[model samples]
Target chain A: VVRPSAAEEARTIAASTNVGTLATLTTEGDPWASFVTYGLLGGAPVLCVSDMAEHGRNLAHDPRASIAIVAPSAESDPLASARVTLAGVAERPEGDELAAARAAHLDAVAAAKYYIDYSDFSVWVLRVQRVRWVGGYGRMDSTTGEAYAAAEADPVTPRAAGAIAHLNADHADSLLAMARNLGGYPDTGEAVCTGADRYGLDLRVTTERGVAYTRVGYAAPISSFDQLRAATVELAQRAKQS
Target chain B: VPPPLTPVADVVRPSAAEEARTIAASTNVGTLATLTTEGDPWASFVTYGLLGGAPVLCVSDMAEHGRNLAHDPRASIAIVAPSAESDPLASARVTLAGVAERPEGDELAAARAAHLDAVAAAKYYIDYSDFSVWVLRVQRVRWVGGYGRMDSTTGEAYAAAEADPVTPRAAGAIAHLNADHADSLLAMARNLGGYPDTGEAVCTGADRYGLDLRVTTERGVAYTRVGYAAPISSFDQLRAATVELAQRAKQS
Candidate 1:
């Protein structure tokens, strides 16, 4: 099993993706899920919302809302991906706080830079109360907002996509070696990196039986982007030696 | 070394009702919002199928949203275009809000068949005593096509609108263009779509009237649409339209 706290997964997903489906109660009290864009300020999500939208009107009356973020899945089915739901109340910040929130949001969404200061638009930050993470089908967990804020997104998250692409494209043989040597799937025919984090890599392999999954760890933990190459190389070198 | 560039906002786009229906028919699963037993909003990850323009779902009574819907039928299903490779917020998404309930004897069979057709695996638990079919009678439709391109449509308009004939064939054509004709996409984004500084271009969407491109530059990322000279009504016409556009880009 790939072990990481639900809080970390929540932070990672919320940080990695820019948009989510914001679930809120309408003025009529019916449930509504609307498309929203956001950026991260610490563990909270910052938004540039306008009162012109129905959702903005709904949130004006009630701060209670939930934001659902899904990481892109390699599979054809989106439901097969990792996703998180953060429920809490959103409130607009004032003075310096609003300015900072606006800058942070603009950093992630460049298009918002144009109208962020418009009178109709305002900045709202979600103070996550309850967090839920579902890694995939049937695998899930829940944690508190306090715990979520304290956890950090995986260190390699920023460069995860490019690195995974490099590994799968150039190091296919090395990945297969690690799968057979370290993953304990000795009869595996092929392997690919399904996920990459500071801890290690999650491998999906094809074997005699069928498709299976395994996790392989680094010789030492990675603390920064520079450490990633060395740590991964060590695993590959060891696998080749054995 | 390159052709002249121009902004493509003059392009023609589908009506809001048509766009909403296309997004709804694009995927079979989405985030379903429902009212809790205590009457608070709760969002759940759920799978669904489309019956005409309505959303058909097979949910178990044991599920959280399932039980919530039992107490209160007020709900919404948000459908997002399923492209994990591209930017999330830079594409089309639609939300259908309305009441959800178990359909009756005559209509239930058709809904069940539709659900099984999309999610064939549902056949295993479809007949379970606790599992039932819930169809949402969409009343309000919200369609957003990235940035400021959005509109609201009434349920009547959404019901009358047809899903784009280009929707099913769009993915294969997108894959082919992204894989084989990267140069062509970059040319379109730089010359026709008006982002000359863009470094890379990826095809994110294809519709009857035009195509959408996600372009990246040193400043940041942006999306643009390039319309075809004439609208395409079928997949055969789609190929012809794209080839003609690629040829137009060569005029420089």
Candidate 2:
């Protein structure tokens, strides 16, 4: 059961991960699923794919598509992971819109530069129609396209990058503490703040097995630099106390 | 004046069928797209294997995706190549669209075996009553070899590629390569594969047309594939090709 606050959490999760399973329709109307690297532009998922790709061809014939953004989890029970699914229609952007799409995509996936200049590659945006957010087992909600767009009104800011760098540079020990106390890791050799959104901070912790990423949610979504700093200070205090 | 015998941009590309076969035989997990009764699309992950190159998945009937498939059999799945040190967009991936159907008689047994064999963990839950095997009869295939290389292959071509016998020899070739030609593989990875920073490289797989290497670098593990100039017919031919490639790589 998602309260109003959970909507922001859902949006945070959506804005965090860039890779998703993109579903489209074939010419015969059968469903097709493929993994795609995506970018969030103005709160909408944008894709830059080669026209020769099946999903691109499918969008030409039928524009309807869906995408599932799943948060990675190392838990034994997968149901504990947060995930969201958005259904929409795929449409090619033109002129200025295309430029923005390309900029947003390239910002997220830097490797796209190698192939973006190819004649076959183009950008498409999914005009969301509806969305379903599943936070964990027994927690779910649905919202209209308009509502999702409205909730994502706050565009991601540079404060996220600043906060991540600041935390990784100065508060890495706190991050390791959070992993040990909040994330239930037995031991962590290294901890770094990978990224941050309105709702939480993403931390990468290295254990004996390997590295794992865990999101530590803020007490409330932070929208400003002041709020981000305050939330970081609070989280560090909590990590120290725990 | 008569036109040149070859086009100015003449280049050799992997065959659609061959690429399809390589993707299908190598990958064990894929994202499956199904539709709800309301026509909305639902995407989820599934462990899969090939039954004659078509994807065969063993899904739990109790799952929502299984129920959705029962209501509407039309679905699509995408299999992506393992990530390597190269640009992410350069890796190969395949998307298959088809109708999911419950296998019967021999098809059921075969599909079950293929699915189980591909995923060792499935052997535990396979006998459960809730588990059912569904085979997607491929209708269309879209293959993206890399940036600027893609095609919409027909169902016939995909099936032909799936039925290619060369894939079965891959396991034996891979073992032989790892055991006998480790240094050769490491050299190929560093030179031909553009991974000069690799400390160790192991042969992960070998196909008729190429070799897949799992490379360890100072940063992390990277997977890479190096192709042969031409396909080989036997282990002896592959050995000769490997020697030639190693020599060329060493020189250039």
Candidate 3:
């Protein structure tokens, strides 16, 4: 059995603009499948779900899920047509990570703006447990086949380590920025919402093959990287003012 | 306001014809218990039909529960009619138990309609050439109605309520666990339900030996006995699991 690299295949497929269908297990162990608009952020796959949705409800009992990046058959040919299945554990993102995830999501998919009003909306991160990619037709073997696979995790991760300790830490932004920039986003470009918190946005932008980041101001034509950082620090210092 | 009660007339002792009538009325349901060669119970909910005068189920005879039925034709089915009140546990439901057999010719077509009306899964059914129709003739049925720690005693139906608010949270947890460990979940079922391997669960079946879990804030945790061959164990487990899982949110 020839082995394929999960990371390598994931990188290849995640980069593709394939619309993903996510499947989670019902509490009774029945398969519940649905569609989702998502993005690759912070070297992790992320998506936001309305608390009212069935898929959303499925998450509360079990955080484990699989997203199938369907092969665009009629639209894209066999070469471009591909299916990638990524299995992972999902939980609400918290603190700075939540803000970043939220922003990256808004940046990637436009529909989120319509439903962000609900307080129940949660930004979930999939700590990838398994990644399977099929290169249309019989090009790729399944995850069950002999190949490089992500060993599953404990299946649940804490969303918030504490309520206040790391609410808006620098490390999270740095990691968020690194992922977006590396994933191809660049400065001044439309940034992907990585996650969200009230303090501004951790927006991401990407060009041909890499992602970049910037903290966009609530006002128009937001300050560039250095300016945004200075502005953010200043804002953080004046917490009581706002 | 105490509304008029949906009469729970014990009606007739469930017979093969009664099972057909009941199966005809319900479009979908929960547990289905079948016995294996070793006399162990196994179960699953495969939308069913009544062809001619026989109760038929659509499945690949290769399914474990399907095999169990081939060995021993006895089985049971639990419909999924939940109540409409805030407390999900407040509602009462019913179950039908009987013997299953394979139906052919004209009987198959009539039985197939029962599933078609309930679940339009015929598309996939037609695709998987392995699919076949099995019939179950009813033997006995016991009606159950009550709430919170209530046993299988016939009583006044509790408030028919919708799922509790915490249902979403519980479902979320279930989804997360299932997605993360499809393989592990399958393994767990195989180990507990006594199936050979997880793949077989996915590959063939009229019924799957899955745990039928119903959760509520009141009942912390309860599980049915292991059914090596039929769905009784599976349904019992699911009902118990639901009650247990629901308690987690109640504690919250």
Task: Give i-RMS (Å) per prediction.
Answer: 1.9, 2.6, 13.5
lDDT (C-alpha, whole model) for all candidates? 0.84, 0.74, 0.45
Worst 10 residues of 3 chain B by lDDT: B153-162
Worst 10 residues of 3 chain A by lDDT: A152-161
Per-residue lDDT of model 2, residues A1-242, tens digit only: 11234455556667766777898876767687877988887768889887976678988888888888766554434445677778888889889988998899988888887767788988889998877787665677777888788775323343455566777888878888887777667487787877676667777888776888777777777666577777877887788777
What candidate 2 keeps of the native contacts, as a fraction, is 0.61
How do the candidates rank by TM-score, highest first?
1, 2, 3
Name the lDDT value of residue B86 in candidate 1: 54
TM-score of every prediction relative to native: 0.74, 0.63, 0.32
Model 1 alpha-carbon drift over 4 Å, by segment? A157-196, A201-220, A234-242, B1-14, B82-90, B120-130, B147-149, B167-252
> What CAPRI grade goes to candidate 1?
acceptable
Binned by DockQ into CAPRI classes (incorrect, acceptable, medium, high), candidate 3 is incorrect
As a whole number from 0 to 100, the lDDT of residue A135 in candidate 3 is 58
Regions of model 3 farther than 4 Å from truth: A1-6, A71-80, A142-242, B1-252
For residues A37-92, what per-residue lDDT tens digits would candidate 3 score against the true structure? 67656446677887766568877877877665542234222223455666667878
* DockQ of each candidate relative to the true complex: 0.40, 0.34, 0.01
